Protein backbone atom coordinates (compact mmCIF):
# COMPACT_ATOMS: atom_id res chain seq x y z
CA UNK A 1 0.00 0.00 0.00
CA UNK A 2 0.98 3.64 0.00
CA UNK A 3 2.82 5.60 2.51
CA UNK A 4 1.29 5.56 6.00
CA UNK A 5 1.44 7.54 8.95
CA UNK A 6 0.96 6.91 12.36
CA UNK A 7 1.14 10.04 14.28
CA UNK A 8 -2.65 9.36 15.76
CA UNK A 9 -3.85 6.49 18.28
CA UNK A 10 -5.69 3.62 16.70
CA UNK A 11 -9.10 4.53 17.66
CA UNK A 12 -11.27 1.97 15.37
CA UNK A 13 -11.17 -0.97 17.80
CA UNK A 14 -14.60 -2.49 17.88
CA UNK A 15 -14.90 -0.48 21.08
CA UNK A 16 -14.20 2.75 21.79
CA UNK A 17 -14.06 1.57 25.49
CA UNK A 18 -14.96 1.63 29.13
CA UNK A 19 -16.03 5.43 30.32
CA UNK A 20 -16.46 4.91 34.61
CA UNK A 21 -17.69 7.62 36.26
CA UNK A 22 -17.78 8.14 39.87
CA UNK A 23 -20.09 10.45 41.12
CA UNK A 24 -19.56 11.20 45.25
CA UNK A 25 -22.40 13.45 46.28
CA UNK A 26 -22.93 12.65 50.04
CA UNK A 27 -20.21 12.10 52.39
CA UNK A 28 -20.23 10.17 55.63
CA UNK A 29 -21.02 12.66 58.83
CA UNK A 30 -17.72 11.77 60.38
CA UNK A 31 -15.90 13.18 57.41
CA UNK A 32 -16.72 16.34 58.13
CA UNK A 33 -17.22 16.86 54.43
CA UNK A 34 -19.82 18.81 52.38
CA UNK A 35 -22.54 16.93 49.98
CA UNK A 36 -21.47 18.40 46.63
CA UNK A 37 -24.96 19.83 44.91
CA UNK A 38 -24.99 19.84 41.42
CA UNK A 39 -22.60 17.20 40.97
CA UNK A 40 -25.97 15.22 39.69
CA UNK A 41 -25.64 17.38 36.55
CA UNK A 42 -22.32 17.17 35.96
CA UNK A 43 -22.52 13.13 36.23
CA UNK A 44 -25.49 13.37 33.99
CA UNK A 45 -23.70 15.70 31.31
CA UNK A 46 -20.84 13.33 31.09
CA UNK A 47 -23.00 10.09 30.58
CA UNK A 48 -24.43 11.41 27.67
CA UNK A 49 -21.73 13.43 25.88
CA UNK A 50 -19.63 10.32 26.74
CA UNK A 51 -22.61 7.71 25.34
CA UNK A 52 -22.29 9.62 22.03
CA UNK A 53 -18.76 9.14 21.52
CA UNK A 54 -20.05 5.86 21.90
CA UNK A 55 -17.98 4.56 25.15
CA UNK A 56 -19.81 1.86 27.40
CA UNK A 57 -20.88 4.66 30.53
CA UNK A 58 -21.10 3.24 33.85
CA UNK A 59 -21.58 5.35 36.38
CA UNK A 60 -21.27 5.00 40.10
CA UNK A 61 -22.66 6.67 43.27
CA UNK A 62 -21.45 7.31 46.36
CA UNK A 63 -18.57 5.06 46.88
CA UNK A 64 -16.59 4.61 50.13
CA UNK A 65 -12.45 4.74 49.30
CA UNK A 66 -12.40 1.08 49.46
CA UNK A 67 -15.11 0.46 46.78
CA UNK A 68 -13.17 2.80 44.80
CA UNK A 69 -10.04 1.10 44.67
CA UNK A 70 -11.76 -2.85 44.60
CA UNK A 71 -13.60 -1.10 41.51
CA UNK A 72 -10.49 0.04 39.74
CA UNK A 73 -8.60 -2.68 40.60
CA UNK A 74 -11.62 -5.05 38.90
CA UNK A 75 -11.56 -2.65 36.00
CA UNK A 76 -8.09 -2.50 35.29
CA UNK A 77 -8.32 -6.82 35.28
CA UNK A 78 -10.87 -6.93 32.82
CA UNK A 79 -9.92 -7.73 29.04
CA UNK A 80 -10.05 -4.66 27.06
CA UNK A 81 -8.13 -5.98 24.26
CA UNK A 82 -11.19 -5.04 21.75
CA UNK A 83 -11.36 -1.45 23.54
CA UNK A 84 -9.43 1.77 21.95
CA UNK A 85 -9.21 3.61 25.24
CA UNK A 86 -10.09 4.54 29.13
CA UNK A 87 -11.69 6.91 30.33
CA UNK A 88 -12.36 7.76 34.15
CA UNK A 89 -14.22 10.50 35.14
CA UNK A 90 -13.53 11.17 39.31
CA UNK A 91 -16.09 13.51 40.93
CA UNK A 92 -15.34 14.69 44.70
CA UNK A 93 -13.72 16.27 47.07
CA UNK A 94 -9.85 16.39 47.07
CA UNK A 95 -6.68 17.50 47.91
CA UNK A 96 -3.19 17.61 45.61
CA UNK A 97 -3.15 14.26 44.48
CA UNK A 98 -5.97 13.03 46.13
CA UNK A 99 -9.85 12.08 46.02
CA UNK A 100 -12.09 11.52 48.34
CA UNK A 101 -14.17 8.58 48.69
CA UNK A 102 -17.43 9.19 50.45
CA UNK A 103 -15.51 7.85 54.29
CA UNK A 104 -11.69 9.02 53.84
CA UNK A 105 -9.54 9.79 50.98
CA UNK A 106 -7.93 7.48 48.32
CA UNK A 107 -4.80 8.76 46.60
CA UNK A 108 -5.16 9.45 42.79
CA UNK A 109 -2.05 7.36 42.17
CA UNK A 110 -3.12 4.36 43.54
CA UNK A 111 -5.99 4.32 41.29
CA UNK A 112 -4.37 5.15 38.11
CA UNK A 113 -1.05 2.70 38.83
CA UNK A 114 -3.80 -0.07 38.21
CA UNK A 115 -3.80 1.00 34.35
CA UNK A 116 0.17 1.47 34.11
CA UNK A 117 1.18 0.00 30.80
CA UNK A 118 2.58 -3.22 32.75
CA UNK A 119 0.08 -3.54 34.22
CA UNK A 120 -2.69 -3.41 32.36
CA UNK A 121 -1.55 -5.03 29.38
CA UNK A 122 -4.36 -4.99 27.60
CA UNK A 123 -4.56 -1.08 27.69
CA UNK A 124 -0.51 -0.79 26.71
CA UNK A 125 -0.16 1.45 24.14
CA UNK A 126 -3.85 2.93 24.81
CA UNK A 127 -5.09 6.39 25.58
CA UNK A 128 -5.78 6.29 29.36
CA UNK A 129 -7.86 9.71 30.17
CA UNK A 130 -8.51 10.58 34.12
CA UNK A 131 -10.48 13.45 34.21
CA UNK A 132 -10.87 14.80 37.65
CA UNK A 133 -13.31 17.36 39.30
CA UNK A 134 -11.83 17.66 42.75
CA UNK A 135 -9.94 20.28 44.88
CA UNK A 136 -6.00 20.10 44.87
CA UNK A 137 -5.92 22.57 47.34
CA UNK A 138 -7.05 25.77 48.81
CA UNK A 139 -5.98 28.62 46.89
CA UNK A 140 -8.04 31.12 44.94
CA UNK A 141 -7.32 32.81 41.95
CA UNK A 142 -7.86 36.29 42.15
CA UNK A 143 -7.82 36.95 38.81
CA UNK A 144 -6.69 39.93 36.71
CA UNK A 145 -8.54 42.55 34.43
CA UNK A 146 11.82 -2.45 22.89
CA UNK A 147 9.63 -1.26 25.65
CA UNK A 148 7.63 2.10 26.30
CA UNK A 149 7.41 4.16 30.07
CA UNK A 150 4.94 2.08 32.18
CA UNK A 151 3.04 6.18 32.66
CA UNK A 152 2.42 6.89 29.16
CA UNK A 153 -0.12 7.35 27.58
CA UNK A 154 -1.75 8.84 30.29
CA UNK A 155 -3.86 12.01 30.33
CA UNK A 156 -4.61 14.08 33.25
CA UNK A 157 -7.24 16.31 32.86
CA UNK A 158 -7.79 18.66 36.15
CA UNK A 159 -10.67 20.67 36.55
CA UNK A 160 -8.11 23.41 38.42
CA UNK A 161 -4.43 24.52 38.66
CA UNK A 162 -2.40 22.59 41.42
CA UNK A 163 -2.74 24.03 44.88
CA UNK A 164 -5.87 25.47 43.76
CA UNK A 165 -9.84 25.33 44.81
CA UNK A 166 -12.04 23.94 41.94
CA UNK A 167 -15.38 25.30 42.13
CA UNK A 168 -18.78 23.92 41.19
CA UNK A 169 -21.89 25.58 40.75
CA UNK A 170 -25.34 23.84 42.98
CA UNK A 171 -27.34 24.25 39.71
CA UNK A 172 -25.64 24.57 36.81
CA UNK A 173 -22.55 21.96 38.24
CA UNK A 174 -19.32 22.15 37.89
CA UNK A 175 -17.55 24.79 35.51
CA UNK A 176 -14.95 22.48 34.54
CA UNK A 177 -17.32 19.84 33.65
CA UNK A 178 -19.88 21.85 31.97
CA UNK A 179 -17.37 23.33 29.92
CA UNK A 180 -15.71 20.13 29.01
CA UNK A 181 -19.37 18.46 28.00
CA UNK A 182 -20.15 21.30 25.81
CA UNK A 183 -16.62 20.88 23.55
CA UNK A 184 -16.66 17.75 23.61
CA UNK A 185 -20.16 17.93 22.01
CA UNK A 186 -19.16 20.79 19.69
CA UNK A 187 -15.77 20.00 18.67
CA UNK A 188 -15.30 15.94 19.23
CA UNK A 189 -15.81 14.84 15.58
CA UNK A 190 -13.43 18.00 14.22
CA UNK A 191 -10.45 18.47 17.26
CA UNK A 192 -7.80 16.70 18.61
CA UNK A 193 -8.16 15.86 21.97
CA UNK A 194 -5.51 18.71 23.35
CA UNK A 195 -6.82 21.48 21.70
CA UNK A 196 -11.11 20.07 22.75
CA UNK A 197 -9.27 20.68 26.03
CA UNK A 198 -7.62 24.21 25.25
CA UNK A 199 -11.08 25.45 24.65
CA UNK A 200 -11.69 24.22 27.69
CA UNK A 201 -9.58 25.80 29.46
CA UNK A 202 -10.45 29.35 27.94
CA UNK A 203 -14.48 28.53 28.46
CA UNK A 204 -13.81 28.08 31.89
CA UNK A 205 -11.32 30.96 32.24
CA UNK A 206 -13.22 33.21 30.80
CA UNK A 207 -16.78 32.63 31.30
CA UNK A 208 -16.86 31.73 35.26
CA UNK A 209 -16.50 33.86 37.75
CA UNK A 210 -17.53 33.36 41.81
CA UNK A 211 -20.27 35.00 43.52
CA UNK A 212 -20.62 34.94 47.11
CA UNK A 213 -21.82 36.96 49.99
CA UNK A 214 -18.39 36.09 51.44
CA UNK A 215 -15.69 38.68 50.08
CA UNK A 216 -12.84 35.41 50.78
CA UNK A 217 -14.54 33.67 48.00
CA UNK A 218 -15.74 36.29 45.77
CA UNK A 219 -14.63 37.08 42.01
CA UNK A 220 -12.28 34.66 41.68
CA UNK A 221 -11.34 32.81 38.83
CA UNK A 222 -10.08 29.28 38.02
CA UNK A 223 -8.03 27.93 35.10
CA UNK A 224 -8.24 23.60 34.68
CA UNK A 225 -4.73 22.31 33.87
CA UNK A 226 -4.48 19.71 31.15
CA UNK A 227 -1.44 17.35 31.92
CA UNK A 228 -0.41 14.92 29.14
CA UNK A 229 1.57 11.60 28.99
CA UNK A 230 0.44 10.92 25.37
CA UNK A 231 2.54 10.00 22.50
CA UNK A 232 -0.10 10.22 19.94
CA UNK A 233 -2.51 12.59 18.62
CA UNK A 234 -6.14 11.67 20.08
CA UNK A 235 -9.28 11.86 18.05
CA UNK A 236 -12.32 10.47 18.80
CA UNK A 237 -13.69 9.87 15.51
CA UNK A 238 -11.60 7.60 12.68
CA UNK A 239 -11.72 7.16 8.77
CA UNK A 240 -14.05 5.25 7.43
CA UNK B 1 -20.84 28.31 43.92
CA UNK B 2 -18.98 26.11 46.30
CA UNK B 3 -15.36 24.92 46.35
CA UNK B 4 -14.71 21.15 45.97
CA UNK C 1 -16.61 1.60 17.05
CA UNK C 2 -16.83 5.44 17.49
CA UNK C 3 -18.02 8.21 14.88
CA UNK C 4 -17.13 7.64 11.68
CA UNK C 5 -15.89 9.92 9.13
CA UNK C 6 -15.47 9.44 5.07
CA UNK C 7 -14.64 12.52 3.88
CA UNK C 8 -11.60 11.48 2.22
CA UNK C 9 -10.77 8.03 -0.68
CA UNK C 10 -9.80 5.14 0.91
CA UNK C 11 -6.39 5.12 -0.42
CA UNK C 12 -5.16 1.75 1.98
CA UNK C 13 -5.88 -0.84 -0.66
CA UNK C 14 -2.76 -3.31 -0.95
CA UNK C 15 -2.06 -0.89 -3.89
CA UNK C 16 -1.89 2.74 -4.22
CA UNK C 17 -2.54 1.22 -8.39
CA UNK C 18 -1.05 2.18 -12.21
CA UNK C 19 0.77 5.51 -13.28
CA UNK C 20 1.01 5.22 -16.75
CA UNK C 21 3.13 8.12 -18.41
CA UNK C 22 2.89 7.96 -22.08
CA UNK C 23 5.89 9.79 -23.37
CA UNK C 24 5.81 11.52 -27.27
CA UNK C 25 8.91 13.10 -27.82
CA UNK C 26 9.49 11.84 -31.90
CA UNK C 27 6.47 12.77 -33.77
CA UNK C 28 6.14 11.30 -37.42
CA UNK C 29 7.64 13.50 -40.34
CA UNK C 30 4.53 14.02 -41.80
CA UNK C 31 2.59 14.96 -39.29
CA UNK C 32 4.95 18.10 -39.29
CA UNK C 33 5.25 18.35 -35.68
CA UNK C 34 9.17 19.11 -33.92
CA UNK C 35 10.28 16.80 -31.62
CA UNK C 36 9.52 17.63 -27.63
CA UNK C 37 13.32 18.15 -26.51
CA UNK C 38 12.99 18.45 -22.42
CA UNK C 39 9.96 15.59 -22.52
CA UNK C 40 12.56 13.20 -21.63
CA UNK C 41 13.57 14.39 -18.13
CA UNK C 42 9.76 14.94 -17.30
CA UNK C 43 8.89 11.23 -17.80
CA UNK C 44 11.81 10.26 -16.05
CA UNK C 45 11.32 13.06 -13.21
CA UNK C 46 7.60 11.48 -12.87
CA UNK C 47 8.33 7.65 -12.62
CA UNK C 48 10.50 8.22 -9.72
CA UNK C 49 8.09 10.73 -8.24
CA UNK C 50 5.35 8.49 -8.63
CA UNK C 51 7.39 5.44 -7.82
CA UNK C 52 8.16 7.54 -4.42
CA UNK C 53 4.39 7.46 -3.91
CA UNK C 54 4.03 3.50 -4.20
CA UNK C 55 2.23 3.43 -7.86
CA UNK C 56 3.00 0.54 -10.28
CA UNK C 57 4.85 2.67 -13.07
CA UNK C 58 4.76 2.08 -16.48
CA UNK C 59 6.80 4.19 -19.01
CA UNK C 60 5.69 4.15 -23.18
CA UNK C 61 7.77 6.22 -25.31
CA UNK C 62 6.46 7.46 -29.04
CA UNK C 63 2.87 6.20 -29.26
CA UNK C 64 1.14 6.36 -32.57
CA UNK C 65 -2.63 7.61 -31.92
CA UNK C 66 -3.81 3.78 -32.22
CA UNK C 67 -1.39 2.39 -29.70
CA UNK C 68 -2.37 5.02 -27.59
CA UNK C 69 -5.94 3.83 -27.50
CA UNK C 70 -5.10 0.32 -27.12
CA UNK C 71 -3.07 0.95 -24.33
CA UNK C 72 -5.84 2.71 -22.48
CA UNK C 73 -8.63 0.39 -23.51
CA UNK C 74 -6.30 -2.13 -22.23
CA UNK C 75 -5.68 -0.69 -19.02
CA UNK C 76 -9.26 -0.21 -19.06
CA UNK C 77 -10.35 -3.57 -18.79
CA UNK C 78 -7.40 -4.70 -16.20
CA UNK C 79 -9.43 -5.83 -12.41
CA UNK C 80 -8.19 -2.50 -10.50
CA UNK C 81 -10.25 -4.11 -7.73
CA UNK C 82 -6.95 -4.38 -5.13
CA UNK C 83 -5.77 -0.41 -6.68
CA UNK C 84 -6.63 2.56 -4.52
CA UNK C 85 -6.76 5.29 -7.46
CA UNK C 86 -5.76 4.91 -11.31
CA UNK C 87 -3.00 7.68 -12.78
CA UNK C 88 -2.43 9.00 -16.10
CA UNK C 89 0.46 11.05 -17.76
CA UNK C 90 0.50 12.77 -20.89
CA UNK C 91 3.11 14.06 -22.52
CA UNK C 92 2.89 15.49 -26.20
CA UNK C 93 1.77 17.82 -28.43
CA UNK C 94 -1.67 19.02 -28.19
CA UNK C 95 -4.87 21.48 -28.61
CA UNK C 96 -7.77 21.84 -26.65
CA UNK C 97 -9.42 18.49 -26.01
CA UNK C 98 -6.95 16.64 -27.92
CA UNK C 99 -3.06 14.69 -27.30
CA UNK C 100 -0.96 14.00 -30.27
CA UNK C 101 -0.09 10.28 -30.88
CA UNK C 102 3.09 10.43 -33.08
CA UNK C 103 1.10 10.48 -35.93
CA UNK C 104 -2.26 12.18 -35.16
CA UNK C 105 -4.17 13.48 -32.53
CA UNK C 106 -6.41 11.32 -30.02
CA UNK C 107 -9.42 12.81 -28.30
CA UNK C 108 -8.73 13.40 -24.87
CA UNK C 109 -12.63 12.38 -24.31
CA UNK C 110 -11.86 8.94 -25.96
CA UNK C 111 -9.25 8.37 -23.52
CA UNK C 112 -10.38 9.49 -20.17
CA UNK C 113 -14.10 7.58 -21.26
CA UNK C 114 -12.40 4.30 -20.49
CA UNK C 115 -12.34 4.37 -17.36
CA UNK C 116 -16.30 6.04 -16.92
CA UNK C 117 -17.95 4.60 -13.41
CA UNK C 118 -19.92 2.46 -15.79
CA UNK C 119 -17.16 2.02 -18.28
CA UNK C 120 -14.40 0.66 -15.53
CA UNK C 121 -16.24 -1.04 -12.49
CA UNK C 122 -13.30 -1.64 -10.95
CA UNK C 123 -12.19 1.88 -10.40
CA UNK C 124 -16.08 3.19 -10.05
CA UNK C 125 -15.22 5.42 -6.76
CA UNK C 126 -12.23 5.43 -7.11
CA UNK C 127 -9.86 9.14 -8.04
CA UNK C 128 -8.79 8.31 -11.45
CA UNK C 129 -6.09 11.66 -12.21
CA UNK C 130 -5.37 12.60 -15.67
CA UNK C 131 -1.83 14.79 -15.97
CA UNK C 132 -1.89 16.62 -19.48
CA UNK C 133 1.52 18.36 -20.39
CA UNK C 134 0.11 19.56 -23.78
CA UNK C 135 -0.70 22.92 -25.58
CA UNK C 136 -4.33 23.68 -25.42
CA UNK C 137 -4.69 26.44 -28.27
CA UNK C 138 -2.11 28.90 -29.41
CA UNK C 139 -3.04 32.46 -26.98
CA UNK C 140 -0.08 33.32 -24.96
CA UNK C 141 -0.11 35.00 -21.46
CA UNK C 142 1.38 38.27 -21.30
CA UNK C 143 1.26 38.40 -17.74
CA UNK C 144 1.16 41.81 -15.28
CA UNK C 145 3.52 43.04 -13.16
CA UNK C 146 -28.47 4.63 -5.89
CA UNK C 147 -26.06 5.56 -8.48
CA UNK C 148 -23.06 7.86 -8.86
CA UNK C 149 -22.25 9.78 -12.02
CA UNK C 150 -20.29 8.23 -14.52
CA UNK C 151 -18.29 11.25 -15.09
CA UNK C 152 -17.68 11.35 -11.03
CA UNK C 153 -13.90 10.34 -9.22
CA UNK C 154 -12.44 12.37 -12.06
CA UNK C 155 -9.29 15.08 -11.81
CA UNK C 156 -7.96 16.61 -14.79
CA UNK C 157 -4.19 18.28 -14.24
CA UNK C 158 -3.99 20.49 -17.17
CA UNK C 159 -1.01 21.95 -17.42
CA UNK C 160 -2.08 25.56 -18.91
CA UNK C 161 -5.80 27.16 -19.01
CA UNK C 162 -8.34 26.39 -21.97
CA UNK C 163 -7.08 28.32 -25.45
CA UNK C 164 -3.50 28.40 -24.47
CA UNK C 165 -0.14 27.30 -25.33
CA UNK C 166 2.26 25.27 -22.60
CA UNK C 167 5.47 25.85 -21.96
CA UNK C 168 8.58 23.27 -21.73
CA UNK C 169 11.92 24.06 -21.85
CA UNK C 170 14.51 21.82 -23.90
CA UNK C 171 16.93 21.25 -20.70
CA UNK C 172 14.91 21.44 -17.86
CA UNK C 173 11.75 19.80 -18.64
CA UNK C 174 8.32 21.25 -18.81
CA UNK C 175 7.35 24.08 -16.41
CA UNK C 176 4.46 22.20 -15.37
CA UNK C 177 5.47 18.59 -14.63
CA UNK C 178 8.73 19.93 -13.16
CA UNK C 179 6.88 21.82 -10.72
CA UNK C 180 4.28 19.26 -9.69
CA UNK C 181 6.78 16.63 -9.30
CA UNK C 182 8.45 18.84 -6.99
CA UNK C 183 5.71 19.91 -4.96
CA UNK C 184 4.44 16.05 -4.64
CA UNK C 185 7.82 15.64 -3.33
CA UNK C 186 7.68 18.32 -0.59
CA UNK C 187 3.74 17.85 0.05
CA UNK C 188 2.58 14.35 -0.70
CA UNK C 189 2.87 13.29 2.86
CA UNK C 190 1.60 16.30 4.02
CA UNK C 191 -1.16 17.73 2.29
CA UNK C 192 -4.58 17.16 0.42
CA UNK C 193 -4.29 16.54 -3.45
CA UNK C 194 -5.90 20.09 -4.51
CA UNK C 195 -3.54 21.60 -2.14
CA UNK C 196 -0.80 20.71 -3.55
CA UNK C 197 -1.76 21.22 -6.80
CA UNK C 198 -2.63 24.87 -6.20
CA UNK C 199 0.78 25.00 -4.58
CA UNK C 200 1.73 23.87 -8.50
CA UNK C 201 -0.17 26.66 -9.87
CA UNK C 202 1.61 29.11 -7.50
CA UNK C 203 5.20 27.77 -8.97
CA UNK C 204 4.27 28.03 -12.43
CA UNK C 205 2.91 31.38 -11.75
CA UNK C 206 5.16 32.99 -10.18
CA UNK C 207 8.88 31.32 -10.93
CA UNK C 208 8.96 31.03 -14.79
CA UNK C 209 8.90 33.15 -17.30
CA UNK C 210 9.61 32.67 -21.10
CA UNK C 211 13.09 33.77 -23.09
CA UNK C 212 12.90 34.15 -26.54
CA UNK C 213 14.54 36.07 -29.53
CA UNK C 214 11.47 36.01 -31.14
CA UNK C 215 9.32 39.17 -29.59
CA UNK C 216 5.75 37.26 -29.95
CA UNK C 217 7.26 34.23 -27.47
CA UNK C 218 9.25 36.37 -25.39
CA UNK C 219 8.12 37.28 -21.49
CA UNK C 220 4.94 35.29 -21.39
CA UNK C 221 3.27 33.43 -18.75
CA UNK C 222 1.25 30.27 -17.66
CA UNK C 223 -0.59 29.59 -15.10
CA UNK C 224 -2.49 25.92 -15.16
CA UNK C 225 -5.81 24.80 -14.98
CA UNK C 226 -6.98 21.91 -11.71
CA UNK C 227 -10.46 20.43 -13.10
CA UNK C 228 -12.10 18.16 -10.50
CA UNK C 229 -14.90 15.83 -10.51
CA UNK C 230 -13.59 14.51 -7.29
CA UNK C 231 -16.00 13.79 -4.14
CA UNK C 232 -14.02 13.55 -1.92
CA UNK C 233 -10.47 14.62 0.15
CA UNK C 234 -7.49 13.15 -1.65
CA UNK C 235 -3.99 12.16 0.54
CA UNK C 236 -1.51 9.94 -1.07
CA UNK C 237 -0.44 8.71 2.73
CA UNK C 238 -3.12 6.72 5.00
CA UNK C 239 -2.98 6.23 8.69
CA UNK C 240 -1.59 3.01 10.38
CA UNK D 1 11.86 27.44 -23.71
CA UNK D 2 9.58 25.49 -26.34
CA UNK D 3 5.73 25.50 -27.21
CA UNK D 4 3.62 22.26 -26.73
Not at chain 1, 18 to 31: G, P, R, V
Not at chain 1, 46 to 59: A, H, I, P
Request: charge should be neutral.
Amino acid sequence: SGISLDNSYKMDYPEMGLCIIINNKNFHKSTGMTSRSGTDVDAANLRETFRNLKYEVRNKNDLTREEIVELMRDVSKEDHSKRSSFVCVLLSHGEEGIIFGTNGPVDLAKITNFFRGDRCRSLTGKPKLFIIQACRGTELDCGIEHKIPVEADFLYAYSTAPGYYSWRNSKDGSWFIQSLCAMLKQYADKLEFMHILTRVNRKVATEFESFSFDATFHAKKQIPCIVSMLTKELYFYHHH
Amino acid sequence: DEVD
